[PDB]
Write an enzyme that holds these catalytic residues in place. Structure first.
Site, mmCIF file in Angstrom:
data_model
loop_
_atom_site.group_PDB
_atom_site.id
_atom_site.type_symbol
_atom_site.label_atom_id
_atom_site.label_comp_id
_atom_site.label_asym_id
_atom_site.label_seq_id
_atom_site.Cartn_x
_atom_site.Cartn_y
_atom_site.Cartn_z
ATOM 1 N N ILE A 87 29.647 41.532 45.524
ATOM 2 C CA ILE A 87 30.834 40.775 45.905
ATOM 3 C C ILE A 87 32.117 41.556 45.649
ATOM 4 C CG2 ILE A 87 32.019 38.564 45.694
ATOM 5 C CD1 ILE A 87 29.455 37.570 44.207
ATOM 6 N N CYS A 88 33.001 41.582 46.641
ATOM 7 C CA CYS A 88 34.310 42.201 46.483
ATOM 8 C C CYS A 88 35.310 41.167 45.980
ATOM 9 C CB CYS A 88 34.788 42.812 47.802
ATOM 10 S SG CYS A 88 36.320 43.771 47.684
ATOM 11 N N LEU A 89 35.064 40.656 44.778
ATOM 12 C CA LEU A 89 35.940 39.657 44.183
ATOM 13 C C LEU A 89 36.924 40.321 43.228
ATOM 14 C CD1 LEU A 89 36.683 36.753 44.155
ATOM 15 C CD2 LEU A 89 34.950 36.315 42.406
#
Ligand SMILES: [Zn+2]
Ligand SMILES: [Zn+2]
Lengths: 150, 54
Positions: A87-89
């Site tokens: 995830i690119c959080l």
């Protein structure tokens, strides 16, 4: 002796069992407290509604001063989630806080499934479709939901 | 909950309960405090309002 990271995980585990899990669910895989298996529901607001998504959570030895390695097990079609489930959080990397609990993180993932950030994409091919042909994105995201998450 | 460090879950001492490293009021242990500021990988700011320590 006893690890500081070991206690922080145990405290959050207690708060998750006392409080209602609601639209989420998370527990330690077997006996290891640093390996968790989460499972959140797809928000109704998002095109991921109806699907149940499983995750893999790996806590570091210096938790909570470092974010847990969270990834998706279920194949999901999202501009900020790749084929590996990573995830690119923002709040995960370079915006992390030792006060942020796993619950806050899982909630942030839900808030990402509903409103993506194509400005800072992880998958350019999907983000391009998200910006140029949103109807096509919505359709595919539901097809994958009913195929992998269901 | 109260009288406990939210990071390492350790009993807050009498020297720790009266320690306010950030104007926001977020309280952590003396060890967790120094850990944040010194550790090369850590940013060294308050886990609440992200205000830099001084
Ligand atoms: Zn502490
Ligand atoms: Zn603060």
């Amino acid at each position: 002796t006893g690890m500081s990271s070991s206690k922080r995980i145990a405290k959050e585990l207690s708060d998750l069992e006392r409080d209602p899990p609601t639209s989420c669910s998370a527990g330690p895989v077997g006996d290891d407290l640093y390996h968790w298996q989460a499972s959140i529901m797809g928000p109704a607001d998002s095109p991921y509604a109806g699907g149940v998504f499983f995750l893999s959570i790996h806590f570091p030895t210096d938790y909570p001063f470092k974010p847990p390695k969270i990834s998706f097990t279920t194949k999901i079609y999202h501009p900020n989630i790749n084929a590996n489930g990573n995830i690119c959080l923002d709040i995960l990397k370079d915006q992390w806080s030792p006060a942020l609990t796993l619950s806050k993180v899982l909630l942030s993932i839900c808030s990402l499934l509903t409103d993506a950030n194509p400005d800072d994409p992880l998958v350019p091919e999907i983000a391009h479709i998200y910006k140029t042909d949103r109807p096509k994105y919505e359709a595919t995201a539901r097809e994958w939901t009913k195929k992998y998450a269901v | 909950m109260e009288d406990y460090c939210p990071l390492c879950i350790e009993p807050m001492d009498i020297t720790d309960k009266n320690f306010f490293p950030c104007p926001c009021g977020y309280q952590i242990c003396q060890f967790c405090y120094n850990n944040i500021r010194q550790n090369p990988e850590l940013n060294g700011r308050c886990p609440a309002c992200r205000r830099k320590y001084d």
